[PDB]
Symmetry: C6
Subunit: 188 residues, 6 copies
C-alpha cells in the first residue's frame, strides 16, 4: 500500500508518513481539475497572430504542476507497493513449501523514496524558480511577433497550492531522513 | 475516521460532531461543481481590454470558497485520522507482544482540530469580509484601464451556501470547546 | 440510514417513508444535471448591455430548485442519521459495560423531520410562487437599461419535476403526521 | 429489487421480467448522454431573433424522451422495492416475536406496475404521436416572428432508440398481463 | 454473467469467448468517448446555410458506430444472463423442495447469441459498406443548397477501431459455430 | 489478473512485472484526459479554409498516443487473463471430477506478451519517428490550399509522457526476455 509497512516500520514511518501521503493525495484530488482544469483554455495572449497562444503556453508551462505532482506521487508510491508485493510473494512461497533480507529491502525502499522526493523537488525548482506565479508573462517565440503579453489564469490559488505541496514534500523528506537515521541507530 | 472516536469520546464528540462533519461534506459535495463550477467562465467585465477578466478575477478571488472549505475539511480530518492510525498501530503492537497516553493524545487532537477550525474561520473572515457577495465589483489593476465594472456569477446562492458553511463551522467550534471542557472536568 | 428505523418504527415509517425518500433521491439524481445543467448558460436576455444576463439570472433565481431540494433532503436525512449514530453508541456502551429514552428520541426525530419538511416547503413557496415556470421574464435591475426580456430554459420540464418533488414532499409530510399520531395513540 | 420476487413469482416473472428490466436500464444508460446529451445545444433555428431557440425547443420537447423513460423506470421499480421492503419488515417482525396476505400484496404490486407501464406508454403516445422524429419543425410562438424553421439533432438515432424502448415496454406489459392471468388461474 | 457457463461449456466457450467479450468491452470503453465524443460538434460543412450541418450528419450517420456496438454487446449478453438467471432459479427451487433441459437451453442460448452476432454484423455492413471512413462527404439534402462538402472528424482512428471490433465479432461468430458443432458431436 | 501468476512465475515475473504494469496503468490514467483531452479542439491551423483543421489533424495524428497505449495495454493483459481463466477452469474441472501443460501454457503466454510489446513498440516507432513532438507542422492536403502551418497543443508534456511510456515498455520487454530465459534455463 501507500507508504507501506513491513513489521519493521517505526512510529514515524507507520503513522506520520501515511498521514502526509493521504493529505497530499486529497489535496491533489481536490485541486487537479478545479484549479488547473482551465489552465490552457483561459490562457490568452494580447495578439492577433493565430497559434501564438498554444506556443506561448507550451513555452511557459513545459509540464503542468498537477501532472508533475502526480508523477512524483506515483514514483514515490512505487517502492512501497513493490516491497508489499515482495512480502506477499515470500509469504506465498513459504506457505507453498529471511528477516535480515526484508530489513535491508525496507531500508533500500526508504532510501529510494527519499531519492525520488529529492529529485522531483529539484526538478520542480529548476523548471519553476520561486514559489509564486505572476499574472503577466512576456513571450517572444515563433510565430508570435517580437514580444507578446500573455496572461495566466488563477496565479494566486496555484501559488497557495504550490506552497502546500512543497511544504508537504519537505515534511516527507525530513521524515524519511529521520526514519533512515532511526533504523541505522537501532540496527547498530 | 472523520471526527474519530477513541473509547474516550463523549456523546457530544461521538454523535454530534460526526453528524456535523457529514453534513458539511454533503453540502460541499452538492455545491462544489453546481454553484462554483462556472465561477471563472461566467465572470465577465465591461471592457474591451484583452486579459482584463482573468486579472480581475484573480484580484477579487485569491482562492475560491469551495477550495478553501475543502482545505479546511482536510486539515480538520487529519488529526482524527492520525489518532486512529496510532490506535491501530498500538493495538497491532500489543497483539504482536497506556490509557493515559491515549487520553492525552485524544485531548491534543481535539485541541488541534479546534485550532484549525479557528484559524480557517479567521482566514475566511480576513479574505472575504462580510457574509454577502455583491453582483458588481470595481477593479483597477493592470492591464485594465482605470476602473472597470466586473460582474460576479450567482452571488445570492453563494451567499446562502457561505452562511450554511459558516454556521456549521461555528457549531463545530462550539462543540469542540464543550468537548475539551467536559474532558477536563471529568478528568479532575 | 435514510428515514432510519429504531425498532419502534411502524409500517408507515419503515416501509413507505423509505420508499418515498428513495424515490425523491432517484428523481433528484436523474434531474440534477440533465434539466438544470444549463440553467445559467442557456439563459439569455434580449439586450446588448454586458453583464445583464448574470444579474438578471441572479435576480430571478436566488437559489436553484435542484440545490434547494438537495439541502432539504440533507436536512431531512440528518435527524435519522443522528438517531442511528446514537443507537450505535448506546449499543457499544452497553457492550462495553433505556427503551423510553429511545422512544422519545425517535419521536423528537420524527417531529424535527416534519418541521424541516414544512419549513422547506414554505421557503419554496415564498421564493417561487406557483408551480409553473414562464418562458419570458421582464427584468429591470442595474446595469440593464429599463426593462429587458430574458428567456428561461426548459420551463415545462422544470415544471413537471417541480410538481413531482412537491407531491413527494407533501406525501412525506402526511406520512410523518400519521406516524406521530399513531405513536401517540399507541403510547396512550 | 427490480421486478422483485416474493417466492410466488413464476418463470415469466422471475426470469424474463428481470432480463427485460436490465435490458431497458442498460439501453437507457448507454443512450442517456450519448444521444440526448446535446439535444438543446445542437438545436438551432433559422432566425435572427434572440431567445427563439429556447422557446421553440420548449414548445416541441415539453419533456425529453430520456427523462420520461427514467421516470417510467423509477415508478415501475417503486412497487417491487416497496414489496421487498414489506417482506423484509415482516420477516424481522416474525424474528422479533400470512401467505395469503403476501400473495395478494404481490398481485396488487404486479397490477400497479402494469398500470404505470400503460399510463406512461399512453402519455408518450399523447406527447409524441408516431414513432419517428423529423429533421425540420415549423414553430410559430412568441417571440419568434411568424413561422421559423428549427432543426432537430440526431432524429434517426433517437427514432431507433424510441423503437427499442417502446418494444421493450410493450413486452413488459404483455408479460405483466400473462403473470396476472397465470396467478389468477393457479389460485382458482 | 457475460458469455456465461452452465457446467456444459467447453474450453472454447468458457476460456476464449469470455476473453473476447472482455476485450470488446474494454475496447468499447476506451473508444466510446475518446474517439466518438466529438463526432457531432467537430463535424462541419462548407456552407453558410443554417441547419445544414445537423441534417448532413444525420444523413451520413443514422446511428453511430459506438452505440451500434453497444446495442450489439447488450443483445449478445442478454441470453447468457437469462440462462444464468434460469439456472439460479432452478437451484433455488430444488433447494426449496433436469440435465437435458439445461443442455438444450444452453444450446439454444448459444444459437441465439450467434444469430444476434450475425444480424448485427449484417446491419453494420448494410449501413456502412466498407471498413474505411473518408474525410470528405458530398451531401445534397434539404435545406442544404445542391451539394455541399462536409468533413468527418478522425476517420483514420475510427477506421482502426472499426477493424478491431469487426475482427473481434468475426472471431466470436467462429467460436460460437465451433461450440455448437462440438456440442452436437459430443451429444451424438 | 494483470501480468498474472501461475505458481510458476519467478521473482522477476511476480514482483517487478506487476509493478511496472500498475505504473503504466496509473500514468495512462493520469495523462489520458489531462494532456490529450484537448488534442483536437486546441489544434488550430493558420488558414481561412473551412474543414482544413480536421483533415490536417487526421493527417498528422492517425491514432492518438493515449489510445495506442490503451490498446497495447489491453492486448498485453489479454494473455494473462486468458491463462488465469484457463487455470480456474482446470481447477473447477478437477473439483467436479497437468503441471507440464500449465508450464507450457505460461511460457507461451509470456512469449505472446513479449511479441505484443515488440509489435506495438515497432508500430509506435513507424507512425511517430523520434521521441519529440514539434510545435509547428506543415500540412499540404486537400482541401487546404498548398501548405498550411498547423500548431500542436502541449508538445513538451506529451514528449515527457511518451518518454515515460517508452521507457516502461522497454523495461517490460527486457523483463519478459529475462523471464523466458530463466524459465528455459530452470527447465533444462
Amino acid at each position: 500500500l501507500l507508504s507501506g509497512v513491513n513489521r519493521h516500520s517505526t512510529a514515524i514511518g507507520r503513522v506520520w508518513l501515511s498521514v502526509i501521503f493521504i493529505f497530499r493525495i486529497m489535496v491533489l484530488v481536490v485541486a487537479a481539475e478545479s484549479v488547473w482544469g482551465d489552465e490552457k483554455s483561459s490562457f490568452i495572449c494580447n495578439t492577433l497572430q493565430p497559434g501564438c497562444n498554444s506556443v506561448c503556453y507550451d513555452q511557459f508551462f513545459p509540464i503542468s504542476h498537477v501532472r508533475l505532482w502526480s508523477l512524483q506521487l506515483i514514483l514515490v508510491s512505487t517502492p512501497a507497493l513493490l516491497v508489499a508485493m515482495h512480502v506477499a510473494h515470500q509469504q506465498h512461497i513459504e506457505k507453498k513449501m529471511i528477516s535480515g533480507t526484508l530489513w535491508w529491502t525496507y531500508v533500500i525502499s526508504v532510501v529510494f523514496r527519499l531519492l525520488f522526493e529529492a529529485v522531483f523537488m529539484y526538478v520542480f525548482y529548476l523548471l519553476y524558480p520561486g514559489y509564486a506565479m505572476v499574472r503577466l508573462v512576456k513571450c517572444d517565440v515563433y510565430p508570435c511577433p517580437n514580444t507578446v503579453d500573455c496572461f495566466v489564469s488563477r496565479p494566486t490559488e496555484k501559488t497557495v497550492f504550490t506552497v502546500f505541496m512543497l511544504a508537504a514534500s519537505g515534511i516527507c523528506i525530513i521524515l524519511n531522513v529521520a526514519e533512515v537515521v532511526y533504523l541505522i541507530i537501532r540496527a547498530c
